[PDB]
């Protein structure tokens with residue numbers, strides 16, 4: 214389709230193996246292989262993600278990533294820098310911070326409520342910004358949270374991103390990762406930005422239990438469980454403070470009406486007991502030691 218030509222008018226022109234040097238593969242997933250690099254001038258280090266378009270197309274969401282992200286900059290988001298197309302590959306240039314994913318922290322260490330509150334505050338800030346600009350991430354999970362060496366928190370991977378409008382402020386595309394999905398998305402009801410709030414809630418369960426509910430099961434079985442069970446239950450709910458349990462239940466409220474939004478969840482008292490972001494850095498050290 215001309216959808217490839219629409220993409221050819223968005224990207225920049227260049228080698229682009231002339232500016233950016235010092236390539237190192239630091240990742241490889243469904244979003245494509247990710248490299249670290251640096252362009253002459255400099256001294257800015259960058260991350261370059263590479264998709265094989267003529268080997269694993271989609272392909273409407275590909276363009277949607279660039280368009281939505283290039284005009285939505287925020288401190289709590291990995292920021293788009295540029296994009297090129299070479300051969301069959303699409304390259305996306307973005308900021309880089311070193312220091313692992315939240316996933317490595319939540320599956321190899323234990324976070325206290327002060328640390329969970331700091332991570333949640335930063336995430337809510339990114340969501341509150343996205344939602345105020347009619348943007349829904351639709352794939353909130355620890356895998357998509359990045360941790361700076363100074364304890365910074367950045368939302369990443371907007372490949373499943375979606376833009377709403379007052380004329381059609383809801384969606385019905387069954388997108389995201391099964392276990393982190395809101396019920397209204399699982400059961401194909403019309404859904405809004407509050408689905409990000411849900412997945413944030415599931416990600417808190419990660420930070421509490423080390424993994425999202427039903428993870429032992431299979432993706433489809435999980436979707437069924439989410440559909441049936443609705444609001445998931447902690448193995449040991451008593452291990453959480455009263456101010457934390459209230460926070461979770463306002464993130465995981467079945468009633469989309471009664472479920473909190475990012476703007477009002479930033480006002481929750483659970484975020485008041487938040488520790489400074491520097492407390493997250495020993496978790497990063499510990500995460501890297503179990504990773505070895």
Ligand SMILES: COCCNc1nc2ccc(C#CC3(O)CCCCC3)cc2n1-c1ccnc(N)n1
Pocket residue numbers: 239240241244247260262278282291292293305307308309310311312313314356359369370371372
């Ligand atoms: C946790 O994985 C470590 C490997 N790094 C990595 N994989 C990525 C996949 C997709 C995107 C992505 C993406 C976007 O959707 C974000 C909005 C702008 C367009 C591209 C970014 C990835 N990164 C980064 C990026 C920057 N720093 C670090 N440490 N890792």
